[PDB]
Symmetry: C3
Subunit: 346 residues, 3 copies
């Protein structure tokens, strides 16, 4: 909701409360999943061509008791945009791989989980410096590209580590070294095609015998297709990763091949059914695991939009993984999940 | 404060800062108690009859040093309301027993503590699905009823528990199995009369030898009366509970009888003195405790309203509990407390 | 940003996102330092002479992974102001010493660090009761004074302590006993001169073998000068402390002498270069340390203001401390730092 617009500065204060419940035999996910998000998007006109902006978004869990608080920053960045030349921002933001993989990240509740957060340049993460160019300097409508750098996020400070430390250090599964990435998308009428590549130095803490998927760099190669016209939405993405896809708690996949596809239809009266399939196939994983499915599920659901501020949904995760030694070892969910949600937003 | 109202959506952003200090011989409550609350209530018009809404409220303590953060979510829910039929909402909300007991929870600082938060269906808690009918299809002015369900909130995940786990699990004093409850209130002119009932399954983690008050289910039965007119506020509530009332850290009371009464007057010049009495009498407690007072105090206080946005208050808790073995074991406060508060709100 | 002004009540919702990166050989400070702040300031007109107000300010780090949250309350207080008589507020707030020392806390990133937070009455802290008078009861334009009390903030409750506990207790380095302080400042045309004194009881937890600088009270004496006109900003402050200045993790300085001076110029086109010198010198530190430099650096930087809502800066801390056993023992940084920041604010 635009709560301020005066003297060249605008502030949008936005958010949502999602009253959400999961039903599953996996009791680690089963039960109340209520959460809220809150954010702001501000923009200031410096000149006719130059605009400044800032964006921040925060999630606060609404399913805990009052003696605990589970909350986190999703994004937090500041930037400058110059008409027909480009934009630059720095902060906690999305990796440029998500420019393409976000196209299938449209399910009512599930989806978008062949990758995670703080997972190299694949989704949300710290220390992204991002250049974006829309419509190729204004010369080619629908052609967008982006170039991105991510600074190292290493070992925790003040804990006796003698190398690889950064001020904002963390556990090895969420670390990264210096990284570079780029994306390109082209949309013409209903159709969209896109590609993205990222390459990040892996840290010394990540490359130990404690974790599968050792290697000098974490790399991803992604291609995507889209159709978004005439009340239909179709999308698919394929990603091949090296030492980049997490395998539960075990570390990373030496190689993974990830695939997501989605089909949706929007009825005039507000109902939007959705069908999706997601898989992540791990190769040469190590420790005698050889090849294993990391993720495999069909998703069927629907959202009903009352209007722009209110919706409700059902989502059914049909989990095709089987309970075996590998999934137990990695802590990967193999159970079905049904989610029921009622969402107010502003 | 309403900060947005446009095209049928409204957003109220509200909060307060309470500069607050306790004086007590009990050093665990003595000192700075400063805090703030923030919240939003949003509503969106779907049709002339149907409205969607959401509410979120958060408390952040203002009395800690900067190397820590003590904050929590009070409520977080989304809902639908249909004109002359009813409403439904889901999330963290108040239990329906509070429809009646809230009537005496009107003291400047203290009060409202014959029960607590995350305490079956008695006050705030997770996973409430709440159905409400106001004015009986608009055919009986002032008559309201509600029926409520609470889903299980069990053992924490990822801690080696082999049963009773939920995604949002917690310590046993704040757990609950599935519950159902209901409330009826009638208000004619200044007068009010009300009743409520709740029945919750108790979890296995709650029914161990480590806690007093073992039982299959927690039940509560409440009656209340109110008078609110001519600058006079009077209210009283009586509640009988079974395996539902906490006895400090010891567990729960096999049976408890709770009573609260308040008298308040509003002077034209802004002063509102308040007198209250609360007691909770436990019976058949176990471990040789037998019958014991869980709570017993007289509260005398006053609030001065400068206007609807600024006020100051003093509240004096004259604590009639005596220091004995039982209160020592349970960690129940037996000392008096004086609170002094200065409050800005919007 | 003023988001509400209606019927005598006013609310300013303000904040900023600082996309920020440090470059340093010290890996404990090196890396992404992105953060955001959010706050509100509210005021209500009670009469033509009396105004009520509240303020709250919060910082949320934007440089961490989503599995943790590093945030805190900077300030949270409520108060009343009566025209030509004075103001009183209570809560988490700034010590009156900062009335004078704030005059040199104007550097683009560094500065303000011969003292810290929760550091007796020197900067932000809990339980301050503060009286202020502007223009000496309206009789002397530009003459301001302040008198302040801070309540004890002691040992944590529930941790087995038998004396010195408060409800909001914390670690010894952030404790304080009861304190009193005052400041006076006179400002006329470009110029300013001012003084402040504070005296706090130190707690028993602070006077143990674990900490250097044992003593009965923490005392500070500060003088300061300022010129602020004709696009020029000059300021200097000198403070003499006893058992009040922290020496990294080691405890406090029996005696310290602190000095800060700054010179800035504002070019019409938006650039504001800055030069500063800071030092803190400890004497009779004990434990064989004798006299030692606690802090010593020159700061050269510049901020470029695109407008009132957008800015960017570079700040270069040239650290004149040498690495020795003392700085290593204390965890005090001796390496240079370059900070680069891009800031959106509203
Ligand atoms: C008592 C304060 C007087 C100090 C004023 C400084 C005068 C220098 C010109
Ligand atoms: C009472 C506040 C004014 C304090 C003036 C003393 C300044 C000390 C300088 C060393
Ligand atoms: C009131 C004392 C002013 C002098 C301060 C000197 C600053 C260095
Ligand atoms: C001109 C500033 C002098 C600094 C010396 C402090 C002792
Ligand atoms: C590091 C250079 C700072 C020197 C500034 C001295 C200003 C004196 C205060 C005059 C008022
Ligand atoms: C620019 C000001 C430098 C101040 C250095 C003071 C050191 C005093 C030594 C005794
Ligand atoms: C602009 C970044 C260059 C890095 C220089 C490092 C200096 C250490 C402090
Ligand atoms: Cl222009
Ligand atoms: Cl937290
Ligand atoms: Mg399965
Ligand atoms: Mg007593
Ligand atoms: Mg040095």
């Amino acid at each position: 909701a635009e709560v301020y617009n005066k003297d060249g500065n605008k502030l949008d204060l936005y958010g949502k409360v999602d009253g959400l419940h999961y039903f599953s035999d996996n009791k680690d996910v089963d039960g109340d999943q209520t959460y809220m998000r809150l954010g702001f998007k501000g923009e200031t006109q410096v000149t006719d061509q130059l605009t400044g902006y800032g964006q921040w978004e925060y999630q606060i869990q609404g399913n805990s008791a009052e003696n605990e608080n589970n909350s986190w920053t999703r994004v937090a960045f500041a930037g400058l945009k110059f008409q027909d030349v480009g934009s630059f921002d720095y902060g906690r933001n999305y990796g440029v791989v998500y420019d393409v993989t976000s196209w299938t990240d449209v399910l009512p509740e599930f989806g978008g989980d062949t990758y995670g957060s703080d997972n190299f340049m694949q989704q949300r993460g710290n220390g992204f410096a991002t250049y974006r160019n829309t419509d190729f300097f204004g010369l080619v409508d629908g052609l967008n590209f982006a170039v991105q750098y991510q600074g190292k996020n290493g070992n925790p400070s003040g804990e006796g580590f003698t190398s690889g430390v950064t001020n904002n250090g963390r556990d090895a599964l969420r670390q990264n070294g210096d990284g570079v990435g780029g994306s390109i998308t082209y949309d013409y009428e209903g159709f969209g095609i896109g590609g993205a590549i990222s390459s990040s130095k892996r840290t010394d803490a990540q490359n130990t015998a404690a974790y599968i998927g050792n290697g000098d760099r974490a790399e991803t190669y992604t291609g995507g297709l889209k159709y978004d016209a005439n009340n239909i939405y179709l999308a698919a993405q394929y990603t091949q990763t090296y030492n980049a896809t997490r395998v539960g708690s075990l570390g990373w996949a030496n190689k993974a091949q990830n695939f997501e596809a989605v089909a949706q239809y929007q009825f005039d009266f507000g109902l939007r059914p959705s069908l999706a399939y997601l898989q992540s196939k791990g190769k040469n994983l190590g420790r005698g695991y050889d090849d294993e499915d990391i993720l495999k599920y069909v998703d069927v659901g629907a959202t009903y939009y009352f209007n722009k501020n209110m919706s409700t949904y059902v989502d059914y995760k049909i989990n095709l993984l089987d309970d075996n030694q590998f999934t137990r070892d990695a802590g990967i969910n193999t159970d079905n999940i049904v989610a029921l949600g009622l969402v107010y937003q502003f």
